[PDB]
Amino acid sequence: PRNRAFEADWLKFTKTPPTKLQQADGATIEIVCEMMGSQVPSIQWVVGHLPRSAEEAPSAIVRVRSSHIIDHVLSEARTYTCVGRTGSKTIYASTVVHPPRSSRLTPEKTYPGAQKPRIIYTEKTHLDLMGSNIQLPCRVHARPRAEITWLNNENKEIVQGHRHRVLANGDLLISEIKWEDMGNYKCIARNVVGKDTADTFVYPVLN
Amino acid sequence: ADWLKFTKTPPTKLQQADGATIEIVCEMMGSQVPSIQWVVGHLPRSEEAPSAIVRVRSSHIIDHVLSEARTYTCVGRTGSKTIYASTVVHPPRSSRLTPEKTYPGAQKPRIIYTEKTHLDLMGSNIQLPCRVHARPRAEITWLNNENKEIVQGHRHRVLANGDLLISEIKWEDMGNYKCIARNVVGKDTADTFVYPVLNEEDEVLF
């Protein structure tokens, strides 16, 4: 019904993970996957296992990004597969990461010190229906654990309230969305060594 | 019904370390295609693209030592809307360098004007910026939504100023377009997400 809102189930990579990466000694690898599709697509990362092979209503359309962090030197080449799902649709893409040819570090041992926050699960774009309850993710990789703050569509810090709740896992829950809620939402993740941020565009999918 | 909002405001105060290059960033989102202009040393006083929505990021580069504190204002415009925000940058306490003189030698590319998101009408022509600060001038390469290098062709053209022109966009054009700016020192990259839509009556252009 060529407003895209009526075409569930569909799912497309918007950032396909690299086919191959070469790890430098001591480097932290971040493998990024991004996809967009009907409803709220989920992304799972699978290590070391290669792939082997409806309502009469509009749906949300969500663009979601997930990062896999390798913060140790690999002992051997390993495969990492991004698996995306929404409804009955599944898409996959894999990355082979190669270890450095030589290393002055212990392989497969997590790098020791503090680590700057990285937001590793986030929605870039959330197009939805008015009145819906939405939950915007902000999952973080950080040592020590990051403090999470959300800004709303007026750049004001969000405090816990009747229609807005910040969850312990970093998610922002907004109940019964309306036009006045539309726009940009920013997650800020901070610890003693640094900060990361991520923006989510929330907008009506229809009319 | 135009709207325009900051998504990243520049810092209100910055301290320049001696010999340091400062990059001031402002990001905004709005209807049509908002533009960002930087105004130096003048504190504020008191194309059209219907159906488009764009996130735009602009950087101002200070690659000289300041002789005195200076103000930098990010001014955004779209339709009849104007927004702005300012930064004061302070010079180093002491400097062994000549003030206001551009730092010598090569500089790694910085992409200083880019759209993070370009939502626009099916059938329309879009022009995605990739403005670069680099010495020597950077080589610019775009990759399409399948990570393949874009060559000059029928619906795709790369301009001398770095812009990617995509003619008569269709649903299959949806996705991320990467600008790579490279010179002898290194590279910078940026992604632009393109989302083709229909107009207010669910039609493509024309």
Chain interruptions in chain B, by residue before each (C–N > 2.5 Å): 46
Contacts of A156 in chain B (CB under 8 A): none
Residue A105's contacts (CB-CB under 8 Å, 6 or more residues apart) are A25, A26, A73
Contacts of B7 in chain A (CB under 8 A): 155, 184, 186, 199
Q: Give the dihedral of Cα atoms A163, A169, A170, A171; nearest 10 deg.
A: -40
Residue length, chain B? 206
Cβ-contact B41, B14 below 8 angstroms? no
Q: Where are the alpha helices (DSSP H) in chain A?
A: none
Q: Do A12 and B175 touch (CB under 8 A)?
A: yes
Supply B76's token pair: 């955004």
Half-sphere exposure of A165 (CA within 13 A, CB side): 11
Contacts of A16 in chain B (CB under 8 A): 146-147
Strand-pairing partners, residue A202, are A126, A183
Question: Is cis: bond before A144, omega within 30 of 0?
Answer: yes
**How many whole angstroms separate alpha carbon A14 and alpha carbon A195?**
25
- The structure was resolved to a resolution in Å of 1.6
**How many whole angstroms separate alpha carbon A79 and alpha carbon A70?**
12
**How many whole angstroms separate alpha carbon B114 and alpha carbon A25?**
33
**What number of other Cβ atoms are within 10 A of residue B2's Cβ?**
12
Q: Alpha carbon A81 to chain centroid distance?
A: 15
Cβ-contact B178, B148 below 8 angstroms? no
Supply B3's token pair: 């709207």
Q: Do A14 and B171 touch (CB under 8 A)?
A: no
Closest listed residue to residue B17, CA positions, set B94, B109, B104: B94
Strand-pairing partners, residue A174, are A134, A164
What is chain B's Cα-based Rg? 19
Cβ-contact A172, A166 below 8 angstroms? yes
CA distance from start to end of chain B = 22
Q: Where are the alpha helices (DSSP H) in B56-137?
A: none
Strand-pairing partners, residue A85, are A42, A90
Contacts of B175 in chain A (CB under 8 A): 12-14
Strand-pairing partners, residue A107, are none
Closest listed residue to residue A79, CA positions, set A71, A89, A90, A68: A68
- From the CA of A205, how many Å to the nearest CA of chain B? 10
How deeply is B131 buried, as exposed, middle or buried, from its count of CB atoms within 10 A (0-12, 13-18, 19+)?
middle
Give me the amino acid identity at A104: R
Q: Are strands A20-22 and A89-98 parallel, antiparallel or unpaired?
A: parallel
Q: B103 vs A141, B64, B185, CA distance in Å? A: 37, 6, 15
Q: Do A201 and B29 touch (CB under 8 A)?
A: yes
Structural domains of chain A in order of their starting residue, each with its CATH number: 1-110 (2.60.40.10), 111-207 (2.60.40.10)
Interface test with A, best of B2, B7, B81, B118 (most A CBs within 10 A): B7
Question: Is cis: bond before B191, omega within 30 of 0?
Answer: no
Q: Alpha carbon B154 to chain centroid distance?
A: 26
CA nearest to A155 within chain B: B7
B 128-187 → A contacts, CB under 8 A = 145-147, 171, 174-176
Interface test with A, best of B120, B193, B202, B203 (most A CBs within 10 A): B193
Q: What is the largest CA-CA distance in chain B?
A: 63
**How many whole angstroms separate alpha carbon B36 and alpha carbon B24?**
13
Supply A105's token pair: 């570090």
Supply A58's token pair: 């509009």
Interface test with A, best of B26, B143, B176, B203 (most A CBs within 10 A): B176
Find the CB nearest A3 among B145, B191, B202: B202
The answer to whether residue B29 neighbours chain A at the CB level (below 8 Å) is yes
Residue A42's contacts (CB-CB under 8 Å, 6 or more residues apart) are A64, A84, A85, A86
**What number of other Cβ atoms are within 10 A of residue A91's Cβ?**
18
Q: B204 vs A1, A3, A170, B120, B164, CA distance in Å? A: 14, 11, 39, 10, 21
Supply A47's token pair: 């290590």
SS3 at position A6: helix
